[PDB]
Design a binder for this molecule. Structure first.
Ligand SMILES: Cc1nn(CC2CC2)c(C)c1-c1cncc(-c2ccnc3nc[nH]c23)c1
Length: 123
């Protein structure tokens, strides 16, 4: 069975509208989203569909760009660091579960390089 996705709405969280948070959605996430290798990361890993019944026995904090996008849209992140942490969790989960040279690892490595380029300078 797939687990429920990470939470994306929480009215009790502290909330703020900042330039960097806006930039992380408008520029960083929305640009990564259009990359040719973004598709595996646009929604939670469907371990049932992908026949990966061990994925959610190994990965304990799942993360994906669809979840990140919903979080940004709900002002779930107080600051850019919290959002950047979720991107890094997403890449790290991929490198934990898979091995160097796997197609999915090549895809994540490409996206991570672009991500680091795009967050090198924030407003
Ligand atoms: C690329 C690719 N290649 N293949 C066929 C090759 C394996 C025999 C498959 C089934 C995929 C693929 C498709 N959709 C999502 C994922 C995925 C997304 C995030 N983390 C993952 N960890 C393991 N998979 C992950 C991967």
């Amino acid at each position: 069975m797939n687990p429920p996705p990470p939470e994306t709405s929480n009215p009790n969280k502290p909330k703020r509208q900042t330039n960097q948070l806006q930039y992380l959605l408008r520029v960083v996430l929305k640009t990564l989203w259009k990359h040719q290798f973004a598709w595996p990361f646009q929604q939670p890993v469907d371990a049932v569909k992908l026949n990966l019944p061990d994925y959610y026995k190994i990965i304990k904090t799942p993360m994906d760009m669809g979840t990140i996008k919903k979080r940004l849209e709900n002002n779930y992140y107080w600051n850019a660091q919290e959002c950047i942490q979720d991107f890094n969790t997403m890449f790290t989960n991929c490198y934990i579960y898979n091995k160097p040279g796997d197609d999915i690892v090549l895809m994540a490595e490409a996206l991570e390089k672009l991500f680091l380029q795009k967050i090198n300078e924030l407003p």
